Design a protein around this nucleic acid. Structure first.
Lengths: 112, 100, 150, 91, 77, 63, 50
RNA sequence: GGUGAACUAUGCCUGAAUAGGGUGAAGCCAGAGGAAACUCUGGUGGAGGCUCGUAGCGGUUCUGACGUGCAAAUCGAUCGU
RNA sequence: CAAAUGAGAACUUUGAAGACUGAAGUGGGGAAAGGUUCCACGUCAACAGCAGUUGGACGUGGGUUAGUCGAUCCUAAGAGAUGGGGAAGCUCCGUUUCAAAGGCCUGAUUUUAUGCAGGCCACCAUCGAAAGGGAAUCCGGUUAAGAUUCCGGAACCUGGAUAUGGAUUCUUCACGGUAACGUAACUGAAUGUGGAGACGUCGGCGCGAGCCCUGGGAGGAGUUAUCUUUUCUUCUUAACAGCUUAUCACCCCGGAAUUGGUUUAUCCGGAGAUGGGGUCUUAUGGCUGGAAGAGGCCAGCACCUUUGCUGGCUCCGGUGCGCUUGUGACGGCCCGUGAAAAUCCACAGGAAGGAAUAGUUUUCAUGCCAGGUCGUACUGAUAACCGCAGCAGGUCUCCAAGGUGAACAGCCUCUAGUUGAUAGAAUAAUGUAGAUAAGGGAAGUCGGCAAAAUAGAUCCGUAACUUCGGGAUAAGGAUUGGCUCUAAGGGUCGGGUACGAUCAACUUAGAACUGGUACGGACAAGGGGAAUCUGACUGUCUAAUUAAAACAUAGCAUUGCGAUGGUCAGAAAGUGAUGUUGACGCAAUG
């Protein structure tokens, strides 16, 4: 069986030195250096993997189009659907309850 | 997959020098080609055709040029034609015998 | 290196538009998603940061300030707490019971977290193995093993 | 199904450390690896991550608690005491 | 390298004023034994990418090669 | 030629074993197969209607 | 080492250029008592310690 | 008054390395018994500063070799892990 | 062994043999170190402890080609200026401190570029990784020696000015999908927020890649007194682009006890299960482009311009507790929970700007230019490093074929590499290393030192004692080969409301037969038991005479201290360690 070598000058099996063996069009077995697999972006509210956003390395987000990095909702690329939905229900209901507390305090202005 | 295949061996070079004749070569071929690895099985599944200078076999059962070359070298070794005769191939299933 | 858990809390800045994070020692029962109220008018609830003078006798407090504004000195290890023995409003003060049993009187403006530090009962399990003591001290400091002087 | 008479989870330590030390460890090791009830969601999903870190896998809430139990007996007493002193304002 | 499936996208690419190279490659490819066809590939060469068109129809190739402008460097082999 | 003989059953007696029963073939692996055989048959019968979901569940726990 | 600094590489250069026998013409020069290069160096024998 | 932690000792920071077996902990499944409490049996599972044993790391015995040596500490077998 | 080269050949080359490393190599690369040992040509005085025509030697030359591989950039433990404070002083502390420590848009925009009211701050040096984090490259070819750098094709990233292709002057800053979300785009300042970077270890399971095995076919080689359609070998496809392809996750729709679904591992469901419908991350695979024109395998012509030309083939599959690596979804562990920053993006927001051929889109596509500097040969070790040396020592790491077998054990073999080590003569005593031995069986000896002795696997059987976990492979016994058979154990479908051919792999168990009773046949591979002293155990040390009963250890106990503090440091200091600490702690002891 054919045996391979590191192509760079790092001789140690570190994270940034992982290789995969590939067969070449010349027929021989060679090493191919593979980099760190990308981690998917996570929602800031719950940490769950964001759906509808491509998983790349941080620098490759500079050259990719906006559609890949976001989704078509409010807070689209930063919080997933269920979190923004929870924020929508929460925002409306607290402000509604605020108007309730505002009139409960306001009766004392009529009483006095 | 069961289509018939036609393998040809051009014996022209040995025959012109008159050292190797197809009359005995074809008889050895039909006697020693085996299908199912047993006896009594040359039932018109493979048949060898000799014209005198170009000898061919046709097969409706399984048969290969590997087998043909293997059997031919057996015959050439048997009658001491090796080191003089080579079983060569021009194209696919288009073998021949060479003196060089 | 700390037995006690820590709590990351986000307060708003009253003077600028910015979220200010603070590193509190987690008291038992505090959960993520919980509001904690810090100040003199904060309610007596586990996790709130009342001044010592604002709490009644017998209040169980932790991470108590030695001086008002030092940001907490006493009863910070896992399972530890401070008790409020009483108050001395004239020359505004408050006497408390420290985890060692010591009695100490300090200013009533010193703040603390209501409740007991979480992670209590840690020393109730035998380490059982030199290796467990090894891992314990490798995140603390180089104080282990100990050769006897004799 | 009954593999050991008494060692239970401490059968991993085998014969070493003394029976009293293994007995003491057995008590707290069963407590620290047990599943607890989540008061927030009502399910039995509260795991210990590290000493004092209790995580519900359903509602994803983290509770500060004891080293080997979700709540120590001392904390529940302080819960009642702080509540009791709180109600003096109410009445 | 890039692939084209549409003829008129090839035509739009031959007229881009940036594509000045064309390579025609004829292959013997078999889809079914009874119909051994002759595959050809029009290998347009641009600036940032090489473009190749695939047609599996021998007859349509002749009409396609007729329509190339005469100024384009055409490599037939 | 020797691989063929082993397939026919020769050269595998007690005088040819050097590893333990578990070392030659893990008992987990044999159990792994057995349960997957039983499970794929129970799901097969459930999908084909030969057994209902209620019989399926008790047999699934049985296997 | 293969991955060397420029400063080390320059030191390799001077040592390699100095590592030659005496020019044969300077021997014949008058009043000259230099018969051989007494500052010769071999990699196996004496290390340059840099 | 200076110079050394390239050996070595210890902390820290950042990396890397460690066949194949034996044993068979918790958790879990199914049966059996029981009034209950709970007990039993067969599986599953894969724990341990467990164990046999490579690489590795050490260095027990021969008080073996050598002992103007291969070597200012090595060599071989036997060994610990 | 022979030849050739040379006065000169045991040692140099070539061929023929015989052997060995036997893929944790005597193979193929690197790190540190070396520094030219690389390579070529001449060449043998010295060196290579014999030899020498040979050489890591001698003399003369050639050789290391980068936007993408590294450094550089970033921060890590930590070093360290300034402010300031000590110090007679060389200097010491200190690193944000008691310091007056801050850019980019049409401001202005004609003595003007700061002549002069245009904001946000709350930044505080810098150095420290050639294994950490990072922008981006692959294949084929090429040399006496360089190559992921040269060449030929084919890409990508960063920086940099306008410009064309699709959209505003009758709604100014897109549509669609009930939704998860989609697409070619589809303004968005200050300020704020989030994500990625960015992480331990072990176990089983699944899925890939490569390797291993194997059927057919198309070639070449081997064997052919006799004999499997036989043995060996080639049959390959990079980066990148497009389409497609997932466990997990999520959305819509009947709303579930006869509780159901479901993993090897038992978790999940009215907080909405099962079921039926539904997106994205070249995870990974497939197809196409790249790309057959490359490369590889055959056949044929060239016949002394340091050079090619021609014809084909390069195709189909199958299999698995396989090996290794990666990935995934999980599960176990901790009083241990397993960096930082640079950097990049996203979001929140709503400052500013937009109507006669115009305004913006340069996060859509296409187009144009540039990418400096330093390193790049070779060894990496029984001769390129360090040990005074070409020293049996020491020195970090990647790849890893077949058979036997549980096995990167031992043994044998393939690819690759070596065949080196002063030699020649019958080999006395004594040795060193390896062995055998009648009868006895430790009588030897300080002492069973040394050696020997059933050692694998299967079945049986297993005592005292015990902290109930063990002891335990206790002890002890039987079997094992070859052959010819038998039995059991699995995977894949068309439903008028119990049915079959296909196909498939090694684990068990049994029987008969057989042989100079042999059979884990080499290899490999526990002696055991009854007790005493002692240390609980695992662990650690006197490198180079002591490995222990010594030291550690968990456990136990005692001591000090609530911070203007305990313990400790400093010449001092506006100085320090514990301390990113707070009695469930730190410190000091036994």
């Amino acid at each position: 069986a054919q045996r391979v070598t590191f192509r760079r000058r790092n001789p140690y099996n570190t994270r940034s030195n992982k290789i995969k063996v590939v067969k070449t069009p010349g027929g021989i077995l060679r090493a191919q250096h593979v980099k760190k697999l990308a981690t998917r972006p996570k929602c800031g509210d719950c940490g769950s993997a964001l759906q509808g956003i491509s998983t790349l390395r941080p620098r490759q987000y500079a050259t990719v189009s906006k559609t890949h990095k976001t989704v078509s909702r409010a807070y689209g690329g930063s919080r997933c659907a269920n979190c923004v939905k929870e924020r929508i229900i929460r925002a409306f209901l607290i402000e509604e309850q605020k108007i309730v507390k505002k009139v409960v305090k306001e009766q004392t202005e009529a009483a006095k | 997959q069961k289509i018939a295949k036609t393998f040809t061996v051009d014996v022209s070079s040995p025959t012109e020098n008159g050292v190797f004749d197809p009359a005995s070569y074809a008889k050895y071929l039909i006697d020693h080609i085996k299908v199912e690895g047993a006896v009594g099985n040359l039932g018109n599944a493979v048949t060898v055709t000799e014209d005198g200078t170009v000898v061919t076999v046709v097969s409706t059962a399984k048969f290969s040029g590997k087998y043909l070359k293997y059997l031919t070298k057996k015959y050439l070794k048997k009658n001491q034609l090796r080191d003089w005769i080579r079983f060569v191939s021009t194209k696919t299933n288009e073998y021949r015998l060479a003196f060089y | 290196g700390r037995g006690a858990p820590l709590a990351k809390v986000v307060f708003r800045d009253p003077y600028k538009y910015r979220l200010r994070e603070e590193i509190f020692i987690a008291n038992e029962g505090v959960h993520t998603g919980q509001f904690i109220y810090a100040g003199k008018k904060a309610s007596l609830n586990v996790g709130n940061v009342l001044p010592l003078g604002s709490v009644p006798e017998g209040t169980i407090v932790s991470n108590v300030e030695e001086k008002p504004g030092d940001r907490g000195a006493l009863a910070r290890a896992s399972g530890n707490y401070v008790i409020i023995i009483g108050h001395n409003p004239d020359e505004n003060k408050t006497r408390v019971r420290l985890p060692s049993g010591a009695k100490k009187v300090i200013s009533s403006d010193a703040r603390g977290v209501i409740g007991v530090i979480a992670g209590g009962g840690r020393v109730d399990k035998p380490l059982l193995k030199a290796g467990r003591a090894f891992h314990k001290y490798r995140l603390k400091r180089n104080s282990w093993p100990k050769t006897r002087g004799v | 199904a009954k593999r050991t008479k008494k060692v239970g989870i401490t059968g991993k330590y085998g014969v070493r450390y003394g029976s009293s030390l293994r007995r003491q460890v057995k008590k707290l090791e069963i407590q620290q690896h047990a599943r607890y009830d989540c008061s927030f969601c009502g399910k039995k999903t509260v795991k210990r991550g590290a000493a004092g870190i209790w995580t519900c896998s359903c509602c994803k809430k983290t509770v500060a608690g004891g080293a080997y139990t979700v709540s120590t007996a001392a904390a529940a007493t302080v819960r009642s005491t702080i509540r009791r002193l709180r109600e003096m304002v109410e009445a | 390298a890039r692939e084209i499936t549409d003829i008129k996208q090839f035509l739009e690419l031959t007229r881009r004023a940036d594509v000045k190279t064309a390579t025609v490659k004829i292959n013997k490819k078999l889809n079914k034994a009874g119909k051994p066809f002759r595959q050809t590939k029009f290998k347009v060469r641009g600036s940032s990418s090489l473009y190749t068109l695939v047609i599996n129809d021998a007859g349509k190739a002749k009409k396609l090669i007729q329509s190339l402008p005469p100024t384009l460097k055409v490599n037939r082999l | 030629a020797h691989a063929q003989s082993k397939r026919e059953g020769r050269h595998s007696g007690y005088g040819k074993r050097k590893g333990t029963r578990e070392a030659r073939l893990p008992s987990q692996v044999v159990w792994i197969r057995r349960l997957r055989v039983l499970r794929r048959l129970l799901a097969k019968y459930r999908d084909a209607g030969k057994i209902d979901k209620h019989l399926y569940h008790v047999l699934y726990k049985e296997s | 080492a293969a991955q060397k600094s420029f400063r080390i590489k320059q030191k390799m250069a001077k040592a390699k250029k100095q590592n030659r026998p005496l020019p044969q013409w300077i021997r014949l020069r008058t009043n000259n008592t230099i018969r051989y290069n007494a500052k010769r160096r071999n990699w196996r024998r004496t290390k340059m310690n840099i």
